[PDB]
């Protein structure tokens, strides 16, 4: 986050494994893997996209 120190906010970042409709609303996005980021002194937030796959290797 590169806002000023006086700015606050909470953000939801999500990962939906394939096969359903791509999320268009927070309501759908929050049913998959997600992190709710609270902005503050630790400036950054990491979401890990876990390996969730049918095949053992995907194509590039």
């Amino acid at each position: 986050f590169c806002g000023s120190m006086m700015a606050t906010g909470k953000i939801l970042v999500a990962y939906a494994p394939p096969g359903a409709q791509p999320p268009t609303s927070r309501k759908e996005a929050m049913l998959g893997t997600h992190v709710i980021w609270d902005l503050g002194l630790q400036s950054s937030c990491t979401m890990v996209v876990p390996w969730i796959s049918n095949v053992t290797y995907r194509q590039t």
Binding site: A7, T8, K10, K27, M30, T33, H34, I36, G40
Partner: protein
């Protein structure tokens, strides 16, 4: 030294994580963490389903806005989650269901805003009706789902004795149920006071007079959020900031499988 604070927390359940950097510690209601029914407290004899990570994860409800004239909001559990993913499906496919919850209420503002929200978790939160008829709020009106309900500043009696609304009329300083709001602090609670914190986290055990019950007929807990001190900012007269409620089922187990319940809400 390395820096752990009771203001910074991470909660992870299933595939969902919450972080907050301005918490005020967290409450475990009545000192009891949730747990499954023990064999010596068990009552239905069929093997329970325990969906585990499929239902015990954080679901975020629709955000509500806190403005200067807001009187408060209330939700009931499990009702607010009845349509949430596989928690709702398991709830409606089974006669009996049991669950504890982590409730995380989110409200950030700035160092120049002020206001304080009281977040109370109430076992058996019976609310008062809108008319001369007693105990007449209907099932669909008593159960708003994730939308929740609101409080009012005064008792507005429904008078259309012809087509009665059959709604609750929760008056705020009476906690919607005939007691004084100031004593609601005997219930598990936190305050989000904007100069101090931006979230409240409360862990709720299953509380009931039975080890397991019908989730469709009975709400175990009510969540009441009221402005103990109203929102204010700079010198503007119409400040509004979001309040978002995220709740996760914990130790969910269900008994009595059959065809799905389809309540009539509309």
């Amino acid at each position: 030294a390395c820096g752990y604070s009771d203001r910074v927390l991470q909660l992870t359940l299933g595939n969902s994580t919450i972080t907050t950097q301005e918490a005020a510690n967290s409450v475990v209601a009545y000192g009891r963490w949730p747990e499954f029914i023990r064999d010596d407290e068990a009552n239905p004899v069929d093997q329970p389903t325990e969906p585990d990570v499929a239902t015990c994860r954080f679901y975020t409800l629709d955000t509500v806005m806190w403005g200067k004239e807001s009187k408060g909001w209330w939700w009931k559990l499990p009702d607010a989650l009845r349509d949430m993913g596989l928690f709702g499906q398991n709830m409606y496919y089974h006669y009996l269901g049991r669950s504890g919850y982590t409730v995380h209420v989110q409200c950030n503002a700035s160092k120049f805003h002020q206001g304080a929200l009281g977040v109370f978790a109430i076992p058996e939160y019976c609310l008062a009706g809108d008319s001369d008829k007693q105990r007449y709020t209907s099932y669909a009106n008593a159960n708003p789902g994730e939308r929740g309900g609101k409080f009012y500043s005064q008792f507005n009696k429904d008078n259309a004795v012809t087509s009665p609304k059959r709604e609750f009329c929760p008056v705020d300083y009476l906690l919607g149920c005939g007691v004084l709001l100031g004593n609601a602090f005997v219930y598990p609670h936190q305050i989000i006071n904007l100069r101090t914190n931006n979230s409240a986290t409360i862990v709720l055990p299953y509380v009931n007079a039975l080890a397991i019950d019908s989730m469709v007929k009975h709400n175990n807990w009510g969540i009441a959020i009221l402005p103990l001190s109203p929102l204010d900012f700079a010198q503007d007269s119409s400040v509004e900031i979001p309040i978002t409620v995220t709740i996760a089922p914990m130790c969910s187990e269900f008994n009595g499988l059959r065809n799905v319940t389809a309540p009539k809400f509309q």
